[PDB]
């Protein structure tokens, strides 16, 4: 059932692209057998740099299951998860992915997959967006303010 | 009032403070600024939305594609109580904003018991070794959505 669930996610990149939704990006969590929610990359068209294939379906099943965190859960997405969607599953924390295409075919197709991963290990102020650390003597405050916080739920 | 970019980060200090403080979410904030003003504000809310994307930054950036009607960040500044994790870092470069301010970093959240240094390191572990296993799996037709892209005359990159 891994290559059905992972075609139905390759089937889905190729409507959104011939659909005008989006990218060549699609994606299905699976649970217990049953598929709780897919995904299509919709950047350009829901104005969300954010909204890939993976988070998209990452988000849509979290609504679904009434949850922050996708317990018990396999992703299936047609393409090797780029910097921002590995980081997602990793807040979410399905128990494993299985991917199609990796990041060099995005890469080859235009998209900045590859080059985000290498831009990580660059030095913050020599990636190609500048990061700069600035000290402030409050930095620690918001988390003593978690510590403090007695009602709070992690994740 | 003259401002600065530490003056942007207190803010984003701030609202990660208050947002732990109103049961928003978690302790980080972020504030996005184009022509030396702010156009919108994240805190982590997580836990409150039920959305382990919905970090400060993240929120912050989906509000400013909002405000400006488009799913790029030209000339906007992001501003971030704590170094972005690897999402954060990853959705800044799909934003593309021009630069990027941090006052905490990776460590300091580690040391809170986040896991944003956790999934930097996971990054280079072979995906089938990683603690969340990555399996590829050959399909012939794993070229079909780029070739579906090529070919679409009306697409939109991104
Ligand atoms: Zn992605
Ligand atoms: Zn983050």
Same mark, same amino acid.
């Given at each position: 059932?891994?290559?059905?669930? &992972?075609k !139905?996610?390759?089937?889905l $990149?190729?409507?959104?692209? @011939?659909? +005008?939704?989006?990218?060549?990006? +699609?994606?299905?969590?699976?649970?217990?057998?049953?598929?709780?929610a897919?995904?299509?990359? @919709?950047? %350009?068209?829901? @104005?969300?740099?954010?909204?890939?294939?993976?988070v998209?379906?990452? !988000?849509?099943?979290?609504?679904?299951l +009434? $949850?922050?965190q &996708?317990?018990?859960?396999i992703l299936? %997405?047609?393409?090797?998860?780029?910097?921002?969607? &590995?980081?997602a599953?990793?807040?979410? !924390?399905?128990? $494993?992915?299985?991917? $199609?295409?990796?990041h060099?075919?995005?890469?080859?197709?235009?998209?900045?997959?590859?080059?985000?991963?290498?831009?990580?290990?660059?030095?913050?102020?020599? !990636?190609?967006?500048?990061?700069?650390?600035?000290? &402030?003597?409050?930095?620690?405050?918001?988390?003593?303010?978690w510590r @403090?916080?007695?009602?709070?739920?992690?994740?």
């Amino acid at each position: 059932n891994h290559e059905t669930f &992972l075609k !139905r996610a390759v089937t889905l $990149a190729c409507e959104g692209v @011939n659909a +005008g939704i989006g990218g060549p990006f +699609g994606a299905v969590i699976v649970k217990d057998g049953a598929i709780i929610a897919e995904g299509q990359n @919709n950047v %350009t068209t829901s @104005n969300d740099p954010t909204a890939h294939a993976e988070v998209t379906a990452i !988000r849509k099943a979290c609504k679904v299951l +009434g $949850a922050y965190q &996708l317990d018990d859960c396999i992703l299936y %997405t047609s393409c090797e998860p780029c910097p921002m969607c &590995l980081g997602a599953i990793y807040w979410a !924390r399905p128990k $494993a992915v299985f991917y $199609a295409a990796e990041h060099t075919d995005a890469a080859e197709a235009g998209f900045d997959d590859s080059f985000i991963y290498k831009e990580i290990d660059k030095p913050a102020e020599e !990636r190609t967006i500048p990061f700069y650390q600035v000290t &402030l003597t409050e930095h620690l405050s918001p988390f003593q303010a978690w510590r @403090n916080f007695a009602n709070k739920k992690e994740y």
